[PDB]
């Protein structure tokens, strides 16, 4: 019933999925052993878990997840971790040899020897599913396997399951920091699959989350744990509408149709608030208007981009907790009267707000504090043009001297595929320019 299948590709995807699944278990009162305690009764909902957890005959809940990673370290540490009983022995695929930070390696040499069994696992999940809403991909385009094998799984899913919803909550190379050097190559190459075979692609680059934790939470040494906790909070905020009963219930298709104006334009902004530490949480008047303003501000967002530099196209707001619709539209009216932001001319409405009743759940040992209300924005806007311009400028700088191209060529991709990638990014950029152009 309104279930979705989560698929985590790459190390970043696997860690993001770990955070998302611990958050989901906390939300549904599911112990790490995989079953709700008989002594305790959380009472969140009779069948809230049904979207993300499949029920067995022994009273045990198993996540509808697929941890697909081409190297054994992350999968084996997940196996040896606390959630060993929660996660299935299958659905937790490990590859023998890493993709070695190469889109060609993960898409043409190591990708095919594992995509068959990955699709088999996906089918063993889908046939169990009865009202499957869609697939939620979690990966990073900058990484080798997360780009290549992610792309392979995406177009195989598109050709197999038809027109099911595909939401890739994907981490992009950051504007200034970046782990790798072939990372621009991987991102630009994976943009193909994230364009044609992804219904919604969600920007989760690094420095935005990094600085958000830096000042909003005031943590001197936050890391991937905190970043993944924030990402999982965003994921839960988006999926709560289909999980629990809400004032304005919006399913994956329900909001992706309002978020995607044109087939190529699905890369979207991300912003969640209130994010606050325990010390500062119990001192502010956390109002719906205040949290909406904080979300709308260029500072407090999960993806490093400036909405002021671009043109807003369509924002989907996900309110959760004791939020009131009058507070929601009062905040909407105030932010529309505010001239700092601006919407594109051909989209006057530009707003899709949905309210759910269950507030964000506490993650003990984390950094979020207990909040009675929260809101997450998924905004399609022309601001992605500048970040994509930076990405393919780095791509052009690397490709002018044909550096690092031998690694990709030797792994089975033609030299012209890089030209394909550069052409596709240029076409997407001028598509954003066209949709932002005034009539």
């Amino acid at each position: 019933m309104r279930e979705a299948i989560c698929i985590h590709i790459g190390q970043a995807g696997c860690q993001v999925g770990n955070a998302c699944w611990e958050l989901f278990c906390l939300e549904h009162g599911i112990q790490p052993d995989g079953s709700m305690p008989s002594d305790k009764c959380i009472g969140v909902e009779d069948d809230a878990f049904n979207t993300f957890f499949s029920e067995t005959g022994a009273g045990k809940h198993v996540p509808r997840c697929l941890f697909l990673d081409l190297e054994p370290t992350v999968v084996d540490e997940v196996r040896t971790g606390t959630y060993r009983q929660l996660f299935n022995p299958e659905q937790l695929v490990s590859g023998k040899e890493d993709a070695a930070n190469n889109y060609a390696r993960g898409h043409y040499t190591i990708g095919k020897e594992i995509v068959d069994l990955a699709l088999d696992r996906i089918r063993k999940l889908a046939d169990n599913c009865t009202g499957l809403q869609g697939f939620m991909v979690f990966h990073a385009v900058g990484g080798g396997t997360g780009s290549g094998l992610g792309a392979l799984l995406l177009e195989r899913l598109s050709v197999d399951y038809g027109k099911k919803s595909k939401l890739g909550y994907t981490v992009y190379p950051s504007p200034q920091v970046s782990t790798a050097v072939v990372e621009p190559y991987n991102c630009v190459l994976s943009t193909h699959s994230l364009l044609e075979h992804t219904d919604v692609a969600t920007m989760l680059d690094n420095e935005a989350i990094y600085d958000l934790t830096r000042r909003s939470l005031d943590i001197e040494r936050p890391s991937y744990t905190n970043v993944n906790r924030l990402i999982g909070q965003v994921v839960s905020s988006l999926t709560a509408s289909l999980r629990f009963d809400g004032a304005l219930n919006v399913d994956l298709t329900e909001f992706q149709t309002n978020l995607v104006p044109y087939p190529r334009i699905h890369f979207v902004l991300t912003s969640y608030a209130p994010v606050v530490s325990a010390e500062k949480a119990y001192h502010e008047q956390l109002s719906v208007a205040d949290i909406t303003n904080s979300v709308f501000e260029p500072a407090g967002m999960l993806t490093k981009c400036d909405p002021r530099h671009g043109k807003y196209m369509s924002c989907c707001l996900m309110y959760r907790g004791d939020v009131v619709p009058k507070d929601v539209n009062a905040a909407i009216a105030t932010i529309k009267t505010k001239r700092t932001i601006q919407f594109v001319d051909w989209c006057p409405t530009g707003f899709k707000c949905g309210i759910n009743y269950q507030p964000p759940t506490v993650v003990p040992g984390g950094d979020l504090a207990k909040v009675q209300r929260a809101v997450c924005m998924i905004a399609n806007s022309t601001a992605i043009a500048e970040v994509f311009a930076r990405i393919d400028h780095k791509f052009d700088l690397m490709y002018s001297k044909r550096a690092f191209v031998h690694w990709y060529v030797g792994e089975g991709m033609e030299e012209g595929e890089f030209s394909e990638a550069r052409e596709d990014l240029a076409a997407l950029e001028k598509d954003y320019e066209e949709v932002g152009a005034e009539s």
Binding site: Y262, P263, R264, D396, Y399, S400, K401, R402, G416, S419, E420, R422, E423, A426, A427, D431, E434
Partner: protein
């Protein structure tokens, strides 16, 4: 800017006879070069366009991005030499719904893919000098089922030997074709 100009028979947008033949062309060149050279095959000066990256090096008409061309002639004809390099061209046109659309053709393309705003298609050019027709109305109706109005922009990327770019309203045999147009 050709809205208030006669458009029948022929309308040349680029030819190497001129002293400064890039009057209405802007050369956005990065890691490349656009210059007038002499060809060994035809023993006449043509326009050499190269770049390590095909996307970064190109010539765009009109030079002003805000300005747009106004050619109604549905036939785009090019005289371009294939150097076995990565080459592409792009034609931005207007439809009957008054929203500009794009047709790009590249020699590194695999299959013809239609998009809401751009149709990407491949080319397989013969050895040596090539003379290429493009039926803008035919491609528009075949890809989009949409009526052709006029051409806003013509763009040619790196790795090309430009000799003549001209619009014509109909097929012109080599017999009818004016001597200044033939090779």
């Amino acid at each position: 800017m050709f809205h208030n100009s006669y458009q029948a028979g022929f309308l040349s947008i680029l030819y190497s006879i001129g002293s400064k033949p890039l009057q209405i062309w802007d050369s956005q060149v990065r890691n490349g070069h656009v210059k007038r050279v002499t060809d060994e095959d035809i023993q006449s000066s043509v326009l050499e366009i190269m770049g390590s990256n095909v996307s970064t090096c190109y010539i765009v008409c009109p030079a002003n991005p805000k300005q747009t061309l106004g050619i109604k002639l549905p036939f785009l004809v090019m005289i371009i030499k294939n150097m076995k390099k990565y080459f592409s061209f792009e034609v931005t046109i207007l439809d009957d719904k008054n929203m500009r659309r794009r047709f790009r053709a590249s020699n590194y393309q695999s299959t013809t893919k239609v998009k809401p705003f751009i149709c990407t298609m491949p080319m397989r050019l013969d050895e040596g000098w090539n003379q290429i027709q493009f039926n803008l109305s035919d491609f528009t109706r075949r890809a989009y089922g949409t009526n052709y109005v006029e051409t806003l922009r013509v763009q040619v990327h790196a790795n090309c030997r430009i000799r003549r770019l001209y619009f014509s309203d109909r097929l012109y045999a080599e017999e009818e074709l004016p001597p200044e147009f033939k090779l």
